[PDB]
Design an enzyme around this catalytic site. Structure first.
Site, PDB file in Angstrom:
ATOM      1  N   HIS A  88      41.360  32.973  30.562  1.00 27.79           N
ATOM      2  CA  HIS A  88      42.164  33.744  29.631  1.00 27.79           C
ATOM      3  C   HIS A  88      41.059  34.092  28.604  1.00 27.79           C
ATOM      4  CE1 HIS A  88      46.145  32.272  31.218  1.00 27.79           C
ATOM      5  NE2 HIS A  88      45.534  31.130  31.470  1.00 27.79           N
ATOM      6  N   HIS A 135      46.459  40.274  36.140  1.00 30.73           N
ATOM      7  CA  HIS A 135      46.688  39.500  34.930  1.00 30.73           C
ATOM      8  C   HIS A 135      45.394  38.755  34.538  1.00 30.73           C
ATOM      9  CE1 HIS A 135      50.787  39.982  36.891  1.00 30.73           C
ATOM     10  NE2 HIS A 135      50.842  40.721  35.795  1.00 30.73           N
ATOM     11  N   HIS A 171      41.311  29.952  36.850  1.00 31.70           N
ATOM     12  CA  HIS A 171      41.333  31.254  36.173  1.00 31.70           C
ATOM     13  C   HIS A 171      41.001  31.113  34.686  1.00 31.70           C
ATOM     14  CE1 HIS A 171      45.501  29.637  35.591  1.00 31.70           C
ATOM     15  NE2 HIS A 171      45.410  30.156  34.377  1.00 31.70           N
ATOM     16  N   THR A 190      51.820  29.261  31.338  1.00 30.14           N
ATOM     17  CA  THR A 190      51.683  30.140  30.187  1.00 30.14           C
ATOM     18  C   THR A 190      51.986  31.615  30.485  1.00 30.14           C
ATOM     19  OG1 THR A 190      49.283  30.438  30.431  1.00 30.14           O
ATOM     20  CG2 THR A 190      50.040  28.543  29.151  1.00 30.14           C
ATOM     21  N   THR A 191      52.409  31.904  31.723  1.00 27.73           N
ATOM     22  CA  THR A 191      52.816  33.267  32.134  1.00 27.73           C
ATOM     23  C   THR A 191      54.106  33.149  32.986  1.00 27.73           C
ATOM     24  OG1 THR A 191      51.776  33.606  34.349  1.00 27.73           O
ATOM     25  CG2 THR A 191      50.316  33.789  32.441  1.00 27.73           C
ATOM     26  N   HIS A 231      41.341  27.329  33.057  1.00 29.51           N
ATOM     27  CA  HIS A 231      42.424  26.513  33.579  1.00 29.51           C
ATOM     28  C   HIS A 231      42.172  26.148  35.043  1.00 29.51           C
ATOM     29  CE1 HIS A 231      45.482  28.435  30.616  1.00 29.51           C
ATOM     30  NE2 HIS A 231      44.704  27.521  30.013  1.00 29.51           N
ATOM     31  N   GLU A 249      44.210  30.223  24.588  1.00 25.99           N
ATOM     32  CA  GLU A 249      45.667  30.102  24.504  1.00 25.99           C
ATOM     33  C   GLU A 249      46.004  28.920  23.559  1.00 25.99           C
ATOM     34  OE1 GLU A 249      47.166  30.302  28.781  1.00 25.99           O
ATOM     35  OE2 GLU A 249      47.777  32.262  28.078  1.00 25.99           O
TER      36      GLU A 249
END
Ligand SMILES: NS(=O)(=O)c1c(F)cccc1F
Ligand SMILES: [Hg+2]
Ligand SMILES: [Zn+2]
Length: 258
Positions: free
Chosen positions: A94, A62, A92, A196-197, A117, A104
């Site tokens: 995004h 991911h 991590h 968020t996942t 994040h 995001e």
């Protein structure tokens, strides 16, 4: 099937297995500058990352996560809107397939090239597993990335990406300093939200920094070379691993600045 970011199993499909996807405190959200309430009772953030111990980095299908030793109070976050001590466990990113999309959280509908994040959990709870069952279990520090000049402290991460190209791969990553990823000022916006996942649990106090860090075209380019797929499967470029902005509903975004 297992969740993802593609046409058939992306954000619009998650609600099928994770009903919480339509909850009241979902993330991410758009930050409307003129509506956020300046709150002067908010205290200044306290980032103590001097004793931080990074262990490894790994591709989980991911995104990629740099993990840290969280068995003792080595790297913590307190102050700001927080109550108690929160331990850093991992960080991590995004990102998107083009410079004008990837983050995001948005600001006045503006999308940045990516978003960092830094995940922390409430020490009151004993371990990470327990923390995710509480309303104030997690604290995630969010940082925007924009395309411009190169970020020295990001390079160490860029160099190692070739060795964790596909799902499941991991590589040792010791002696990394997270303090090289912070912008000059620690001014922020804060609101109560969620992961968020999937599992999309509503246990997070979001702290989004105002000042974005800048990274080079080449630096983000290497992010886009990772793969969603494991070794031996067809190649699917790891890009656009972000969730669309969710409705704010009955919440309020507080700012620590005017
Ligand atoms: N992206 S995120 O910050 O909300 C996030 C975490 F911090 C931790 C686990 C899953 C996840 F999705
Ligand atoms: Hg929770
Ligand atoms: Zn994230």
């Amino acid at each position: 099937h297992h969740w993802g970011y593609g046409k058939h199993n992306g954000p619009e499909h998650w609600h099928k297995d994770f009903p919480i996807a339509k909850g009241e405190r979902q993330s991410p959200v758009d930050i409307d500058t003129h509506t956020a309430k300046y709150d002067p009772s908010l205290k200044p953030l306290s980032v103590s990352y001097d004793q931080a111990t990074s262990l490894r980095i790994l591709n989980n299908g991911h995104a990629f996560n740099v993990e840290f030793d969280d068995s003792q109070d080595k790297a913590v976050l307190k102050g700001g809107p927080l109550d108690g001590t929160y331990r850093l466990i991992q960080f991590h990113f995004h990102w998107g397939s083009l410079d004008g999309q990837g983050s995001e959280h948005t600001v006045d509908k503006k999308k940045y090239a990516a978003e960092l994040h830094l995940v922390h959990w409430n020490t009151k709870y004993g371990d990470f597993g327990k923390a995710v069952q509480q309303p104030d279990g997690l604290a995630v520090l969010g940082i925007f990335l924009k395309v411009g000049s190169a970020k020295p402290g990001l390079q160490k991460v860029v160099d190692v990406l070739d060795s964790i190209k596909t799902k499941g791969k991991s590589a040792d990553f010791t002696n990394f300093d997270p303090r090289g990823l912070l912008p000059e000022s620690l001014d922020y916006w804060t609101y109560p939200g969620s992961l968020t996942t999937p599992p999309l649990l509503e246990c997070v106090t979001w702290i989004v920094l105002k000042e974005p860090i800048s990274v080079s075209s080449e630096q983000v380019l290497k992010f886009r070379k990772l793969n969603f797929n494991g070794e031996g499967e067809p190649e699917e470029l790891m890009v656009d691993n972000w969730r669309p902005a969710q409705p704010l509903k009955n919440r309020q975004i507080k700012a620590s600045f005017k």
